[PDB]
Amino acid sequence: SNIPYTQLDMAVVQNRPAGSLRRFVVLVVGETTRAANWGLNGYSRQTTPLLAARGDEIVNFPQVRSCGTSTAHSLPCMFSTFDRTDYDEIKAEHQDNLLDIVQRAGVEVTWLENDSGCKGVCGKVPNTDVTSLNLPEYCRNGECLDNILLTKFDEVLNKNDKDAVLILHTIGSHGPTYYERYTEAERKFTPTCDTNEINKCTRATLVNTYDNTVLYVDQFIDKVIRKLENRDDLESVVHYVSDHGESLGENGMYLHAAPYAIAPSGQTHIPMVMWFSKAFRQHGGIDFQCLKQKAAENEYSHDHYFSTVLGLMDISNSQTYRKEMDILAACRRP
Numbered sequence: 197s198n199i200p201y202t203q204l205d206m207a208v209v210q211n212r213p214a215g216s217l218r219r220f221v222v223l224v225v226g227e228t229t230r231a232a233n234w235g236l237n238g239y240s241r242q243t244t245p246l247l248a249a250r251g252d253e254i255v256n257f258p259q260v261r262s263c264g265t266s267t268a269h270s271l272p273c274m275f276s277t278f279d280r281t282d283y284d285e286i287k288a289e290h291q292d293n294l295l296d297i298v299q300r301a302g303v304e305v306t307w308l309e310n311d312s313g314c315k316g317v318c319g320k321v322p323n324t325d326v327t328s329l330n331l332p333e334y335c336r337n338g339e340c341l342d343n344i345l346l347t348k349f350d351e352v353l354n355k356n357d358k359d360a361v362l363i364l365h366t367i368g369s370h371g372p373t374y375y376e377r378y379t380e381a382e383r384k385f386t387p388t389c390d391t392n393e394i395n396k397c398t399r400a401t402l403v404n405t406y407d408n409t410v411l412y413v414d415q416f417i418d419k420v421i422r423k424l425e426n427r428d429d430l431e432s433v434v435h436y437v438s439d440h441g442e443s444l445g446e447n448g449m450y451l452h453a454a455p456y457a458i459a460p461s462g463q464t465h466i467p468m469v470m471w472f473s474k475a476f477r478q479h480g481g482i483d484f485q486c487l488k489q490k491a492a493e494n495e496y497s498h499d500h501y502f503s504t505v506l507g508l509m510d511i512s513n514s515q516t517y518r519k520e521m522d523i524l525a526a527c528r529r530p
């Protein structure tokens with residue numbers, strides 16, 4: 197209430213081609229996973245084997261920077277019109293965010309939370325806290341394995357046939373209970389640090405445990421793709437990006453939330469990948485070989501998130517959309 201609230205893009209609509217198929221976009225908002233331990237970026241361990249095996253169909257972005265080093269900064273920033281370097285916390289809090297605008301355009305927006313909170317971003321859209329289900333197959337000590345989200349996916353997919361944006365907010369690589377982020381099938385690197393007292397384990401075991409968390413991210417993204425890839429009637433996109441990275445003892449630094457100005461690359465350099473369904477490849481208007489090249493050669497950040505999502509919903513009458521910030525715009529047919 198401190199300053200008047202600005203509704204943005206009040207006349208927004210979708211401008212999808214006439215007679216088009218449903219468009220279903222999944223935004224996986226990761227947590228703590230860093231670029232330097234991401235197999236597709238050339239890490240010496242293959243922490244992303246399922247995505248690597250999918251080959252050309254996964255677009256990987258080797259140079260992406262976060263807008264903050266904690267969830268409290270990164271989430272509101274990445275869902276706002278503001279860029280990191282001009283972010284105004286107060287202004288952002290008193291205006292519509294990305295999800296408010298997309299919902300106003302008539303898109304079904306749903307937020308499934310498994311990471312302790314949306315930091316105010318999903319207040320005005322349908323949202324559920326999946327962690328609270330406290331299912332023994334996934335959950336212990338108030339935290340749940342991210343595959344619990346998959347159990348709620350089909351309900352969203354089948355809610356109706358409107359275009360949709362589904363946000364899956366994952367707990368990812370969050371520590372210091374890194375060992376609780378994955379299961380036996382992803383416990384590849386050993387020995388591990390099976391305590392929250394990470395300062396008491398060797399740096400070698402800490403890296404091993406963190407790397408196992410990335411294997412779980414990889415299989416999670418793969419399972420989301422598997423829910424969509426056989427729906428030939430559906431134009432689907434899966435987009436994954438982390439909120440920030442992590443420090444694993446380098447120079448005495450652990451966890452995250454270092455002030456951005458002094459934050460090491462481990463905390464600011466984050467993974468990002470995209471996958472497109474067959475129908476999206478056919479009717480989505482994107483030159484895929486163009487996009488693979490752009491992804492390899494350019495530097496991106498959370499600043500690109502807002503316009504990339506608007507572009508994926510064919511949003512029109514939008515004064516917030518910036519073509520130069522839309523990752524796909526330079527490879528989209530006019």
Ligand SMILES: CCCCCCCCCC[N+](C)(C)[O-]
Nearest residue numbers: 278279280281282283284499
């Ligand atoms: C307060 C930080 C906001 C970011 C603005 C960075 C300058 C953009 C203008 C660049 N330009 C070459 C056109 O002058």
Ligand SMILES: [Cu+2]
Nearest residue numbers: 197198199290
């Ligand atoms: Cu206020």
Ligand SMILES: [Mg+2]
Nearest residue numbers: 273276277278
């Ligand atoms: Mg932004």
Ligand code: NA
Nearest residue numbers: 370371372373
């Ligand atoms: Na945690």
Ligand code: NA
Nearest residue numbers: 380381383384
């Ligand atoms: Na194992």
Ligand SMILES: [Zn+2]
Nearest residue numbers: 228266267439
């Ligand atoms: Zn975080």
